[PDB]
Structures are given as C-alpha cells and as structure tokens.
Amino acid sequence: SRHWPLFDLRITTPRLQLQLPTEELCDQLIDTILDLPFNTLSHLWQQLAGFKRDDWSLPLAVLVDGRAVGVQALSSKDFPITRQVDSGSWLGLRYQGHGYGTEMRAAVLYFAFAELEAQVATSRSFVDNPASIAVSRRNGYRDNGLDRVAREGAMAEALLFRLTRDDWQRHRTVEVRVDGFDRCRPLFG
Amino acid sequence: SRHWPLFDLRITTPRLQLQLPTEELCDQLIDTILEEDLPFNTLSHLWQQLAGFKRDDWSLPLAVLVDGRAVGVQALSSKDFPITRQVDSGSWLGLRYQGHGYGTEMRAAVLYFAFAELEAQVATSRSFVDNPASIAVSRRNGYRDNGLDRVAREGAMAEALLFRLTRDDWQRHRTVEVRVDGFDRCRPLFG
Amino acid sequence: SRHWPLFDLRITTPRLQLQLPTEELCDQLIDTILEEDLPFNTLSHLWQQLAGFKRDDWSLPLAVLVDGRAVGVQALSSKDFPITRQVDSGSWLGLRYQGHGYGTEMRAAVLYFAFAELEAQVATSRSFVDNPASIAVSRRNGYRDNGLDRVAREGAMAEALLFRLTRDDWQRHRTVEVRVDGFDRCRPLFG
Amino acid sequence: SRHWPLFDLRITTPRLQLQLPTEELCDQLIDTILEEDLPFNTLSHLWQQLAGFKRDDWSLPLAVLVDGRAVGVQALSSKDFPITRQVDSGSWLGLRYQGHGYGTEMRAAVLYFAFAELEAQVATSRSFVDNPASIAVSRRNGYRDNGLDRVAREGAMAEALLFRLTRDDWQRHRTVEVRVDGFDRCRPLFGP
Ligand SMILES: [Sm+3]
C-alpha cells in the first residue's frame, strides 16, 4: 500500500532484496508455495494489520532478481523495553541450498541491530530441520534451550537460539543496506 | 488477490460496480476518506475483515465504484449464516459523492446478493438517529422498524434505529436492477 | 468472596432473595440444573462473568433464592453503562420452580436495582419466541416490543423477541416491593 | 466446588498440603498477599485459570497450606500436554513464609504430580535473574540450565534464567516423599 511507510522499507544484500509483501509479491509467494492460498493471505493480512509499537510482526518477502522466493519474518513484543526481536522464515523448495537462508537472516539481523538498535535476537528450529540450524550457526547464534511442541499431532522438539549485538557484530560477513527507514522510525518507538 | 475467488465476485447496478477491495481499490478508498492514523486504521480494518472470513463468521467489505473510482464501501456480514439465514450491513460513502442516490443503490446491490445468491431470509441494518442519509437508504430500500437502541459514540450516548427486511417483502417490492457475476466459485465458502 | 463488595449486595422481594453466587450457591444452582459436561460448563461461565467485571462492561449473574435454595439466575449486564444508562437482562429458572410467579418477581427485583440504585434510563431484554413465560414476564413488567433477532441455538435457528422498558414504563407497571442492601460500598464500581 | 473433581485432588508433603483453591482458600491467599485493586485482580486471575481448564490448554493453580494457613500458590500449566508431555510451573510465597524451605518442597510436590501422575517427560520453569530464591529451588530440584530470556517487567527489562528437568533426572535424584489423593477420577480430564 502507498498509505503505510513500512511498504517503502528496503533491505538489500548483494543477492537479495527484502520488503513488505504487496499484493503482487503475496501472489508470487503463493505460486512459490504451490486451502493453502487463503491461509497464506489470511496470515499475512493479520500480521500487517496487527502492527503496534508494543507487538509487531514484519513478514518480509525475500526477492531474488525481483521474484519473491520466501519470507523472512522479524517480530517483537514490548520491543521498546526488551530490545529483543525474534525471527521465523520459510524459503521455496527450489530456492533452498543456495545460501539464501543465511543471507536473508543476515539481512533482518542487520536491520534489527543497526536500525532498530536491538540488543538480542532469538530464533528457533525444529531439531529435524538442520538447514535452519546451520543458518543460525553461521550467523553466530548460541544455543538457548530446548522446547517441545505439538507439530501436526505429534511431539516435535525445537532448539532455541540467542544472538546478542556483540556476538552478531563479531560474526557478520554479509553487506546489508537499508533504505526507506527514516519515515518508519516513529512506528517502533 | 488472484488466489481467493471472492475477489472475482462482481455486483453491478445501473450506475455502480461492487467488488472486494484489491490493493489499488483500498488505496483509492483511503484517498476518498482523506478528501494521521486514519490511513493505517483503514487498511488494518479492511485487512482484518479480508483475513477473518469463515463460513460461520464473515464480513464482506465491498468497494463501491462509480465510473472506475472507489467512492465508498458497502459491507455485508453474518455470524452463523447457514443457521440464521440473517445478514447485517454497514457502509460509508465519501462526502463528495453523497447526494446522488448512490447510497440507496449500493444497499439494493448487497440486498440482491444476500437474498438472490446467499438465500438469506432477513437483512438487518442500523443507523444513528442523526445519520439521515443512512436512514433514508433504509426507508428507500423498504426496511421495517426493528427497534430503538443506545450506544456510546465518542464518550456520549447515541441512540440508534434498527431496521429489518424480510425476503418476501423484498421479493414483492424491490425495484433496483442488480446483476451478480462470479458467485458460483464462491458458493461453497458460504454454505 | 469476602474481598469483593458485590458479594455483599442483597436484593429482596416478598418471596425472593437475589445475590451474587458464592461457591455454595453456584453448586446449588448446578444441583437445580441437573433436574456430564454441564457442571463444569456452568462453573466456567459463572467464573468468567465474575472475573470479567469492568465499569464499562459488566455482567451480574444473581442467584435467585427461594427458602434458601438457589432456584435460578437473574442476570443484569451493560456495556458502557455510565454513558448509555441502559441495561440488559437474561434469566433462567429450574423446571420445578416455574409457574409460581417467581419469574416476574425476579425481573422486578433487578429492574428496581437498575432504575432505583444504578439510575438507569432504559432496560432491555430478549426472549425466544418459544418461551412464552419469559415473554409474559416482560409484558407484565411494562416492556414494549423492540424488534426481532435470529440466532443459532443448539445448531438451529431460534427467533428472539426484543423488549425495551423506559423508566416511566417501569414506574407505571411496578407492583412488587423490593429492598436493596449493601449497595453503598458497590457504588464506585459502577461509576 | 463439589461439581468439579479437580477440587478433590490433594497433594501432600511432610509439611504442606496443595489443592485447588476454594472460595475460602482464595480469600486466605489474598489475606496473605495483603500482609487496592489487588483483591479483585487476584480473584479475577484465579477465576480465569479455574474456568479456562481444557485438556489441550490448562493451568492448575494450587493453594499451598502449612497447617491450614494459605502461604502461597504453586502452579502447573501445559499446552497440548497429551502430545508434548511437557509441563511448566510458576509460584509465589508470602513474604512472611520465605526462607523456611517451603519453595523447594512445593516445587517437589508438583514435580511428583507431573511425573508420577500425569506421566510428564519434561518439566520447565523460569526465574528472574534477581530472584535468587526461585533459582535455588530449581537448582535444589535438579533442573538444568535451559537458556536466557528478556521480558518487560513493570516497564523495565528483566532477564530470566530458564530451567528444564527431565523425568529420568527426577527419578534418579528426587528426595521428597509426596502423596497424591483424589487423582483417579481426574485421569480422563488430562488425557485425549
Ligand atoms: Sm414474515
């Protein structure tokens, strides 16, 4: 939308551009994924609509050559107080195995640490998703506990991760640029 | 969106087209309203209605187009529709588009959709007692009185008129020519 | 509870006493209803209503006592009361206590509390069309017809008649002596 | 209530009795806390937890009694318990009642309930880094480190240590004798 400055945020790496999904990018994302189409829109709509200073979720479309290939989300409750963010992500099947996962994580963590002035970033992976765990290792996260949840009716264990600003800085390798954030700054605090 | 059949629904009258608001229509609708927090408030509300559709609890905000331009919104909603067969409506129309009878026509459009396509038995609406435009729309569309209510509006008491229109009353007295296109693929979502 | 002044409220009529249900009274109300999920569902609903009390959104589920036995519930509730000055009521009465004039006495009890203690200007109620006893109680107490609503009830459509009672209509029709105790300490909670 | 079997559950240790708070016990717990909005805030919170019980999402706030006096609450919670077999706990103890070893004993009580009766596989807890007592309870009860969090607490950032205890570790190292009465009837309430 042209009535919401978060739509003008761009985060760019040498290979990727991240931005809030417009109608066109959402439909590209659904093609990438392909009840699922509506569930995907519904979820993105609800995240966009629920943005508040003290409870926000930014689902960023990840673009390779201008094409949406997945989503890298950043979120936080009580950010102005905790200075802690959490992330989640998915990447289309045919785009996995090319290091986009690591690069797109790098991109949101730069945004978090350099623009939002976060002090900690968290993530989690199912223990049977080594690719996502490898992304966390590469970005310098430290193990931060075990959790058990219901995943499609069966027990799944999740590994939790913690990345401080200092550890982030020591481990970073990806060049990241942020544009459009000046008008957005008042939304976060 | 190209991945949700409700976006292909079209309701057309002699002067109007109603359809689910796309990204472009939402932004046009916000342009109309602005004729600070209001833009996000508006997107947020539309987004939550689009995302919240459930067979047993839905709201359908339809952008109202006059010669291409989004001039306002005519909504229809219902909780437990398959059981109640009762729908409710609410609406707004940009100030510079008021006084042309678009209000009456847009209400007639969703009533046709509710009765002819959804097979509703009853449609309801409400107006603040000091909204003469909405009250006129209801009278021109042949609704019955259905009660007097009171609510809080901006920290003060506001009285509200309730309206009810039944399917047979509508069948026998309706006068607006309405066409619905793209409903067959939507049909399963409602029943 | 000894920590919430609403528990000290007493409304008394010639044959009835109404009060917020304590633990023992909730359990008697459940005894009454049972003339497997039902006990917990009742408990859960009463707890949630007790817990949800807010000045701008409250529900008062009053146990109705005949000779010490909890026989039914006469509820009063209101959203934005300080602004609207309007209250709503609902009730149920155990099967074997029906047909003895308790329904009208229990409505008179809460109506007096609303108009004389809370200083309400309007009281509303609704009754399903297939509940003529409850309809008659509304007519007996002076309520006027105020619309029709359809809702889902046990997976089937049930039509409700809505009722409206102004303070003047209340006054004109009131016959039952009502006394209210323990309200002074509750006063701040309501406004 | 005499219409909800969870009220007939009793968990006892050498010094303590734990049970779901009746109306009288809620009022004693509030008396203990008071040693303005606080009474109703407490009632409303207990009422909501009592009412919110579902197989797939429950919270069990247990009043802790020392010779009939209500000194605190030891809670046990789980979302999707029948699947995860993981429980979480939280608790408070009246200022007057701290430093007597009740915190460790009350934790031991719910752990035994969780592992011996609910057949939990994992128990978790968290403590603010500036709550040395709660941290010591987790350590005395054999929990291991399970990470670091930050939360907003009264408008300021507060760090919390997370703790995790497995059934095996509990079985090997538990020390407190615990008795649980009134659980048989409650079995179907916790299973699918
Ligand atoms: Sm009729």
Residue-wise DSSP of A14-39? SSEEEE---HHHHHHHHHHH--HHHH
Give the bridge partners for D126, in sequence order: D162
The answer to whether C18 touches C117, Cβ cutoff 8 Å, is no
The rounded distance, in Å, linking the Cα atoms of D148 and D128 is: 10
Contact A148, A157 (CB under 8 A): yes
Q: How far apart are CA A75 and CA A50, in angstroms?
A: 11
Nearest to B170 by CA among B123, B137, B126: B123
Closest CA to D62 of D186, D192, D188, D191: D186
For A146, name the nearest residue in chain D, comparing CA atoms only: D146
- Using DSSP's 3-state secondary structure scheme, residue B88 falls into strand
Phi, psi of D61 (to 5 degrees): -85, 115
Distance from CA of C70 to the nearest CA of B (A): 33
Measuring CA to CA, which residue among C127, C150, C130, C151 is closest to residue C139?
Answer: C127
Distance CA B6, CA B2 (A): 10
Both structure tokens of A99: 């290091």
Cα(B160)–Cα(B146) distance, integer angstroms: 11
d(CA C87, CA C74): 13
Helix (H) or strand (E) holding A2: none
Residue B185: Cβ within 10 Å count? 11
- Beta strand C156-166 with C179-181: parallel, antiparallel or unpaired? unpaired
Rounded-to-integer distance, Cα C139 and Cα C163, Å: 9
In whole angstroms, give the CA distance from residue D26 to residue D18.
13
C-beta atoms surrounding A54 within 10 Å: 12
Q: Where are the alpha helices (DSSP H) in D52-180?
A: 81-84, 102-112, 132-140, 167-173
CB contact under 8 A, A155 and D122: no
D16-19, strands of its sheet edge to edge: D144-153, D156-166, D122-128, D86-93, D69-79, D57-66, D16-19, D10-12, D179-181
DSSP-based three-state secondary structure for D103: helix
Distance between CA atoms of residues A37 and A51, nearest Å: 22
Question: For strand C86-93 and strand C122-128, is the pairing parallel, antiparallel, or unpaired?
Answer: parallel
Residue D78's contacts (CB-CB under 8 Å, 6 or more residues apart) are: D57, D58, D84, D86, D87, D88, D120
State how far the Cα of C90 lies from the Cα of C138, in Å rounded to an integer: 11
How far apart are the C-alpha atoms of A57 and A76, rounded to whole Å? 7
* Spatial separation of the C-alpha atoms in residues D62 and D113, rounded to whole Å: 12
Half-sphere exposure in the Cβ direction for C149 (13 Å, CA): 19
d(CA C135, CA D80): 45
Length of chain B: 191
C-alpha pair distances (Å), B129 with each of B162, C13, C78: 10, 38, 21
Angle at B81 between CA D53 and CA A50, to 5 degrees: 60
Of the candidates B111, B103, B100, the residue with the CA atom closest to the CA atom of residue B174? B111
Contacts of B141 (CB under 8 A, 6+ apart): B104, B107, B108, B111, B165
Resolved by? X-ray
Residue pair C65/C17 in contact by the 8 Å Cβ criterion: yes
Nearest-by-CA chain C residue for D44: C51
- Cβ of A160 within 8 Å of Cβ of D151? The answer is no
Name the interface residues of B facing A (CB cutoff 8 Å): 1-4, 22-24, 26-27, 30, 39-40, 42-45, 47-48, 50-53
SS (H, E, C) chain C: CCCCHHHHCEEECCCCEEECCCHHHHHHHHHHHCCCCHHHHHHHHHHHHHHCCECCEEEEEEEEEECCEEEEEEEEEEECHHHHCEEEEEEEECHHHCCCCHHHHHHHHHHHHHHHHCCCCEEEEEEECCCHHHHHHHHHCCCEEEEEEEEEECCEEEEEEEEEEEHHHHHHHCCCCCEEECCCCCHHHHC
How many alpha carbons lie under 13 Å from residue B15 in its C-beta half-sphere? Answer: 13
Count CA atoms within 13 Å of residue C104 on its CB side: 20
Chain A CB contacts of D129 under 8 Å are: none
**Tokens linked to C37:** 């999920």
Joined tokens for residue A97: 């195995």
The rounded distance, in Å, linking the Cα atoms of D169 and C127 is 60
What is the four-CA torsion angle of A23, A29, A31, A35, rounded to 10 degrees? -90
Q: Return d(Cα A14, Cα C113) in angstroms, integer.
A: 72
**CA–CA gap between residue A48 and residue A51 (Å, rounded):** 6
DSSP assignment of B91-144 equals EEE-GGGTTSSHHHHHHHHHHHIIIIIS--SEEEEEEETT-HHHHHHHHHTTPE
Topology given in CATH for the domain delimited by D1-192 = Aminopeptidase (3.40.630)
3-state secondary structure of D93: strand
Chain A neighbors of B22, CB-CB under 8 A:
23
Q: Virtual CA dihedral for B164, B166, B172, B173, nearest 10 degrees?
A: 10
- Known binding-site positions of B for substrate: 74, 89-93, 99-104, 125-131, 140
Return the H-helix or E-strand segment holding D38.
helix D38-51
Domain A1-189 has CATH 1.10.3720.10: no
* Residues of chain A neighbouring D156 (CB-CB closer than 8 A): 81
Establish whether D53 is an annotated binding residue.
no
Residue B10 has phi, psi (to 5 degrees) of: -135, 130
CA distances from A54 to A187, B17, D152 (A): 10, 40, 10
Asked if residue D74 lies in contact with residue D110, where contact means CB atoms within 8 angstroms, the answer is yes
Burial of B188 (0-12, 13-18, 19+ CB in 10 A): exposed
Rg, C-alpha atoms of chain A: 16
Instruction: Tell me how far CA of residue B142 lies from CA of B104, B108, B159, in angstroms.
Output: 10, 10, 21
Q: Where are the alpha helices (DSSP H) in chain A?
A: 23-33, 36-49, 79-82, 100-110, 130-139, 165-171, 185-188
Task: Name the nearest CA neighbour of C88 among C96, C80, C78, C74.
Answer: C78
Q: How far apart are CA A151 and CA C87, in angstroms?
A: 46
Buried b (16+ CB within 10 A) or exposed e, B67-88: eeebbbbbbbbbbbbebbbbbb
The chains in contact with chain A, meaning 3 or more Cβ pairs closer than 8 Å, are B, D
CATH superfamily of B1-191: Gcn5-related N-acetyltransferase (GNAT) (3.40.630.30)
Instruction: Give the type of residue at D145.
Output: D
Q: Which long-range contacts link D138-147 to residues 24+ away (Cβ below 8 Å)? A: D138/D107, D138/D163, D138/D165, D140/D104, D141/D104, D141/D107, D141/D108, D141/D111, D141/D165, D142/D169, D142/D170, D142/D173, D142/D174, D144/D169, D146/A145, D146/A146, D147/A143, D147/A144, D147/A145, D147/A160, D147/A162
Beta-carbon contacts of A141 under 8 Å, excluding residues fewer than 6 positions away, are A121, A123, A161, A162, A163, A167
Closest CA to A102 of A161, A177, A172: A172
Q: Do chains A and B touch (3 or more CB pairs under 8 A)?
A: yes
- Pairwise CA distance, residues A27 & B2, whole Å: 7
Tokens of B183: 């409903």
Question: What CA–CA distance (Å, rounded) separates A50 from A44?
Answer: 10
In chain B the first and final C-alpha atoms are separated, in Å, by 22
Q: Which two tokens stand for residue B149?
A: 């209510």
Gap between the Cα atoms of A82 and A84, Å rounded: 5
**Whole-number Å distance between alpha carbons of C64 and C60:** 12
Give the DSSP H/E element, type plus range, for residue D115: none
b/e burial code for range A157-185 (CB count within 10 A of at least 16 → b): bbbbbbbbbebbeeeeebebebeebeebe
Residue A141, SS3 per DSSP: coil
C84 and B150 within 8 Å at the Cβ level: the answer is yes
CB-CB neighbors (< 8 A) of D164 in chain A: 145-146
Number of neighbours of residue B12 by Cβ within 10 angstroms: 16
> Residues 6 or more apart from D139 whose CB is under 8 A from it?
none
> Which amino acid, residue C159?
E
Which residues of A lie inside 8 Å of B (Cβ-Cβ)?
A: 1-4, 22-23, 26-27, 30, 37-38, 40-43, 45-46, 48-51
Q: Of the candidates D55, D51, D61, D59, which has an alpha carbon nearest to the alpha carbon of residue D80?
A: D55
HEC secondary structure over D177-190: CCEEECCHHHHHHH
C33 vs B4: CA distance, rounded Å: 47
Best residue of D86, D127, D138 to probe chain A, by most A CBs closer than 10 Å: D86
Distance in Å, alpha carbon of C128 to nearest chain B alpha carbon: 14
- Specify whether the CB–CB gap between C123 and C115 falls below 8 A: yes
Query: Distance from the CA of B140 to the center of ligand 1, in angstroms?
Result: 19
Q: How far is the CA of B54 from the centre of ligand 1 (A)?
A: 28
Residue D98: strand, helix, or coil: coil
- Gaps (C–N > 2.5 Å) in chain C: which residues precede them? 35
Tokens at A5, concatenated: 């400055």
Sign of CA dihedral A137, A139, A142, A143: negative
Q: B178 near B112, Cβ under 8 Å?
A: yes
The tokens for C127 are 């009754």
Rg of chain B on CA atoms, in Å: 16
Q: B24 is written with which tokens?
A: 């472009």
β-bridge pairing A67-77 and A84-91: antiparallel
Residue with tokens 């590209």: A28
Contact (CB, 8 A) for A73 and A60:
yes
Asked if residue C87 lies in contact with residue C120, where contact means CB atoms within 8 angstroms, the answer is yes
Helix axes C23-33, C38-51, angle to 10 degrees: 140
Give the amino acid at C20. Answer: L
Q: Which residue has the tokens 């009258």?
A: B13
State which residue of chain B sits closest to C87, comparing Cα positions: B150
Domain residue ranges of chain D, discontinuous segments joined by +: 1-192
Instruction: Report the C-alpha gap between D166 and B150 in whole angstroms.
Output: 57
A81-97 per-residue burial string, b: 16 or more CB within 10 A, e: under 16: bbbbbbbebbbbeeeee
Amino acid identity of D17? Q
Describe the crossing of helices D132-140 and D102-112 by its angle, rounded to 10 degrees: 50
- Report how far residue A104's alpha carbon sits from residue A11's, in angstroms, rounded to the nearest whole number: 9
Nearest to A162 among D148, D152, D164 (CB): D148
Q: What is the DSSP letter of A139?
A: H
Residues B143, B164 contacting (CB under 8 angstroms): yes
> Could you tell me the distance, in angstroms and rounded to a whole number, from the CA of residue C88 to the centre of ligand 1?
26
Kindly give the distance from the C-alpha atom of residue B163 to the centroid of ligand 1, in angstroms, as a whole number: 14
Q: For residue C137, what are the CA distances in angstroms to A131, C72, C164, C180, D187?
A: 69, 15, 13, 21, 45
Beta bridge partners of residue D128, listed in sequence order: D160
- Cα distances from D29 to residues C1, C25, D81, in angstroms, run 12, 21, 28
Q: What are phi and psi of A96, to 5 degrees?
A: -75, 160
Asked whether C and D share 3 or more beta-carbon pairs under 8 angstroms, the answer is yes
Strand partners, B151: B158
Contact C50 D43 (CB under 8 A): yes
How far CA A48 is from CA of A20, A44, A58, B124, C155, in Å, comes to 9, 6, 7, 31, 34
Report whether B14 contacts B55 (CB < 8 A): no
Give CA–CA dist C57/C41, Å, rounded: 22
Find the residue in B nearest to A37 (Cα).
B3
The residues, any chain, with a CB within 8 Å of residue D172's CB and separated by 6 or more, are none
Tokens 């963010």, residue located: A85
Are C138 and C163 in contact by the 8 Å Cβ rule? The answer is yes
Q: 């035994």: which residue's tokens?
A: D112
Q: Letter for the amino acid at A50? A: G
User: Could you give the 3-state DSSP secondary structure of residue A1?
Assistant: coil
Contacts of C152 in chain B (CB under 8 A): 80, 83-84
Helix B38-51 with A36-49: angle, nearest 10 deg: 150
D12: β partners: D17, D179
